[PDB]
């Protein structure tokens, strides 16, 4: 079925939970043996969220190459994404090592450091120009260059230096700051505006390594971001945009990381975003 009318049909019939459970039943199951080794327990935020072995990002280290991060490679859309958990106190150096080694331009953050009164990720970037951060375990230096605070999101320019080679690179930090503590946004308008700002920066383009996207577990909000982006790109590429099937795209992405889209409300929100976005792209 088309999307917008499939949407109204699920709303009128109140069957979002049943649709979402079908997706959960049909989703791929691949091994995640490296994630579950005992030496990696303090590298995982949640015991039930792990990268598959076949698609995990490897650190270029011979001691321990493990990080909770997955490469999502979308062949028809010609887009790649790295989805990862919010960094832990003992993995902030690993996180920036990955950004460096994978040649990423942009980092997309979809959570606040504190939500619901608890910490959802480490403070992993510097908050003042004159107070830079050094990660001694991976030999990197990170400096805040500029910060632009808007009503729904903040964009930061950061300088990452490999202290071993003295090479430097500019990283863009796109921070969506207004996702509610409970539920999903009422309107997708500010989320779509944010997605378009990431796009306009070049961070998603083939001349760079894959964008790094995270929330707390790296599957819910993060899944919503890459699902909406890929579906909108496919609608631009195909002769028949109504052929794009968001449930099929989601199941393809779940071949590369488990659990993408965590609730039926996040599934409905993804439909809403793609539907509204497809009208702005044109006419
Ligand atoms: O330092 C840390 C201590 C524990 C945790 C959480 N570990 C979750 C688990 C993963 C696998 C089995 S249990 C994170 C960091």
Going by the annotation, the residues of the binding site for substrate are 181, 215-221, 262
Active-site entry in 121, 215, 226, 231: 215
Distance CA 176, CA 190 (A): 9
Structure tokens at 76: 């028809």
CB distance 239 to ligand 1 below 6 Å: no
215 is catalytic: yes
Give 90-94's long-range contacts (Cβ < 8 A, gap of 24+): 90/42, 90/43, 91/43, 91/67, 91/122, 92/122, 92/124, 92/135, 93/135, 93/136, 93/137, 93/138, 93/140, 94/43, 94/59, 94/67, 94/137, 94/138
Distance CA 172, CA 106 (A): 5
Going by the annotation, the residues of the binding site are 181, 215-221, 262
CB distance 44 to ligand 1 below 6 Å: yes
Q: How many CB atoms lie within 10 A of CB 110?
A: 24
**What order of strands is seen across the sheet that includes strand 140-149?**
56-58, 66-74, 79-84, 211-214, 106-109, 167-176, 153-162, 140-149, 133-135
Distance CA 267, CA 250 (A): 10
Burial-class residue 101 by CB neighbours within 10 Å (0-12, 13-18, 19+).
middle
Residue 183 C-alpha from the chain's centroid: 18
CB distance 47 to ligand 1 below 6 Å: yes
Q: Where are the domains of the chain?
A: 1-283
The closest residue, in CA terms, to atom 2 on ligand 1 is: 42
CB distance 41 to ligand 1 below 6 Å: yes
Cross-strand bridge partners of residue 241 = none
Helix (H) or strand (E) holding 169: strand 167-176
The closest residue, in CA terms, to atom 10 on ligand 1 is: 47
The per-residue DSSP string of 91-104 comes to THHHHHHHHHHTTB
The closest residue, in CA terms, to atom 6 on ligand 1 is: 45
The domain defined by 1-283 folds into: 3.90.190
The closest residue, in CA terms, to atom 1 on ligand 1 is: 42
Cβ(185)–Cβ(179) under 8 Å? yes
Do the bridges between strand 133-135 and strand 140-149 make them parallel or antiparallel, or are there none, so unpaired? antiparallel
Experimental method: X-ray
CB distance 88 to ligand 1 below 6 Å: yes
SS3 167: strand
């Amino acid at each position: 079925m088309e999307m917008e009318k499939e949407f109204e049909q699920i709303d009128k019939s109140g069957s979002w939970a049943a649709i979402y459970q079908d997706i959960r039943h049909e989703a791929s199951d691949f091994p995640s043996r490296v994630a579950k080794l005992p030496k990696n327990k303090n590298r995982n935020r949640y015991r039930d969220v792990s990268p598959f072995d076949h698609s995990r990002i490897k650190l270029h280290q011979e001691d321990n190459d493990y990080i909770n991060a997955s490469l999502i490679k979308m062949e028809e859309a010609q887009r790649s994404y790295i989805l990862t958990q919010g960094p832990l106190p003992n993995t902030v150096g690993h996180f920036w090592e990955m950004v460096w080694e994978q040649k990423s331009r942009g980092v997309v953050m979809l959570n606040r450091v504190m939500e619901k009164g608890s910490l959802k990720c480490a403070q992993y970037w510097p908050q003042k120009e004159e107070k830079e951060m050094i990660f001694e375990d991976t030999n990197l230096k990170l400096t805040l260059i500029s910060e632009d605070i808007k009503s729904y999101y903040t964009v930061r320019q950061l300088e990452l230096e490999n202290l071993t080679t003295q090479e430097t690179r500019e990283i863009l930090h796109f921070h969506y700051t207004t996702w509610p503590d409970f539920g999903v946004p009422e309107s997708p308008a500010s989320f779509l505006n944010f997605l378009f700002k990431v796009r306009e920066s070049g961070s998603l383009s083939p001349e760079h390594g894959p964008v790094v996207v995270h929330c707390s577990a790296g599957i819910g909000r993060s899944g919503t971001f890459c699902l909406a982006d890929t579906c909108l790109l496919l609608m631009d590429k195909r002769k028949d945009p109504s052929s794009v099937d968001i449930k099929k795209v989601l199941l393809e992405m779940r071949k590369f990381r488990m659990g993408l889209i965590q609730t039926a409300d996040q599934l409905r929100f993804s439909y809403l975003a793609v539907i509204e976005g497809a009208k702005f792209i044109m006419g």
